[PDB]
Paper text:
The second enzyme, [name], is found in the bacteria [name], which is able to grow on poly(butylene succinate) ([name]) as its sole carbon and energy source. IsPETase and [name] are highly homologous (82% sequence identity and 89% sequence similarity). Given the sequence identity and the presence of the same catalytic triad, [name] most likely uses the same reaction mechanism. Despite the enzymes showing a very high sequence identity of 82%, IsPETase shows significant hydrolysis activity for both polymers, whereas [name] only shows significant hydrolysis activity for [name].
[name] was expressed and purified, and the structure was solved to a 1.5 Å resolution. Solving the structure of [name] enabled the verification of the positioning of the functionally active catalytic triad, as well as providing an experimental structure for modeling substrate interactions. As expected from the high degree of sequence identity with IsPETase, the RMSD value between both structures is low, 0.41 Å (262 aligned residues). Consequently, the canonical catalytic triad of [name] (residues S174, D220, and H251) aligns very well with that of IsPETase (residues S160, D206, and H237), with the residues surrounding the catalytic pocket very similar for both enzymes. However, despite these similarities, it is interesting to note subtle differences in the shapes of the two binding pockets. The cavity in IsPETase is broader, slightly longer, and, toward the right-hand side, is shallower when compared with the cavity in [name]. For PET, product formation (TPA, MHET, and BHET) shows that only IsPETase is able to catalyze this reaction, while [name] did not cause any significant PET degradation above the negative control. The rate of production of succinic acid was slower and plateaued at a lower level compared to [name] and [name] alone. This suggests that PET is binding to [name] active sites and competitively inhibits the turnover of [name]. The restricted space surrounding the catalytic Ser174 residue in [name] appears to be playing a key role in hindering the reaction. For [name] with PET, the nucleophilic attack is sterically hindered with the Oγ–CC=O unable to adopt the necessary distance expected for the reaction.
Author numbering: 42 to 304
Write the structure that this text describes.
């Protein structure tokens, strides 16, 4: 069979490194956020069918601005994205996971609400999780707790829980070589090395500080290509993105690349 989740034309290096995919996007603020503080929903106006939904959580003391470049980037390729603010900026990773799932729950209900810009735009069975630092650990925790999640792509993850051996959710860990907040060999390395049952990839930005994948970063061409490709391959089962998702980028801006069980 045709894969009914395929959206957009065949990807290219340049179409993926571009700021924007083939779809127009708009956004709205969530009026009455349920179980988190605030949310901006990015969506394609014209994806040619329902698309999956991704919730993205900031790090400790941070807000939507740290992680919201992902909103337009992913929405323009055919995803509905919610970037959230947490109940408290001091929330820890387990709390962030709960709020991440709550945000996905509300994206889903809004997609079933006739009032909403995203009415009928979402396949609420196809969800992804992303986030920075403690929001990244929350994404791992979400994936651990809920194996039906299709994909995880946290960045510079921080988590006091170290054991993700149970993960079957395809996970791309974005890491920052010189991270002094969520040091790679105490966080990202440990998380990755615990995994064995899931498609997975480790993409570490050369000399990256803790904020190496945040809004305004100097590696959007590479990071955006990889994040979109991962979400396409695993959220849409879209085999046109296997090579993009699974390949070594062979970039000098990558200090360490690892991959396993990726086709």
């Amino acid at each position: 069979q045709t894969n009914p989740y395929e959206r957009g034309p065949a990807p290219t290096t340049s179409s993926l490194e571009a700021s924007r995919g083939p779809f127009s996007y708009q956004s709205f603020t969530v009026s009455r956020p349920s179980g988190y503080r605030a949310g901006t929903v990015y969506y394609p106006t014209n994806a040619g069918g329902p698309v999956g939904a991704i919730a993205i959580v900031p790090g400790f003391t941070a807000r939507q601005s740290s992680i919201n470049w992902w909103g337009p980037r992913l929405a323009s390729h055919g995803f509905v994205v919610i970037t959230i603010d947490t109940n408290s900026t001091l929330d820890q990773p387990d709390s962030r996971s709960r709020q991440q799932m709550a945000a996905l729950s509300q994206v889903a209900t809004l997609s079933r609400t006739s009032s909403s810009p995203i009415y009928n735009k979402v396949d609420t069975s196809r969800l992804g999780v992303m986030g920075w630092s403690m929001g990244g650990g929350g994404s791992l925790i979400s994936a651990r707790n809920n194996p039906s999640i299709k994909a995880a792509a946290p960045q510079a993850p921080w988590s006091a829980s170290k054991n993700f051996s149970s993960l079957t959710v395809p996970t791309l860990i974005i890491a920052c070589e010189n991270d002094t907040i969520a040091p790679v060999n105490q966080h990202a390395d440990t998380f990755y090395d615990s995994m064995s049952r899931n498609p997975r990839e480790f993409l570490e930005i050369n000399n990256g500080s803790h904020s190496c994948a945040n809004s305004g970063n100097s590696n959007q061409a590479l990071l955006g290509k990889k994040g979109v490709a991962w979400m396409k391959r695993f959220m849409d089962n879209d085999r046109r993105y296997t090579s993009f998702a699974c390949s070594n980028p062979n970039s000098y801006n990558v200090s360490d690349f690892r991959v396993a069980a990726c086709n």
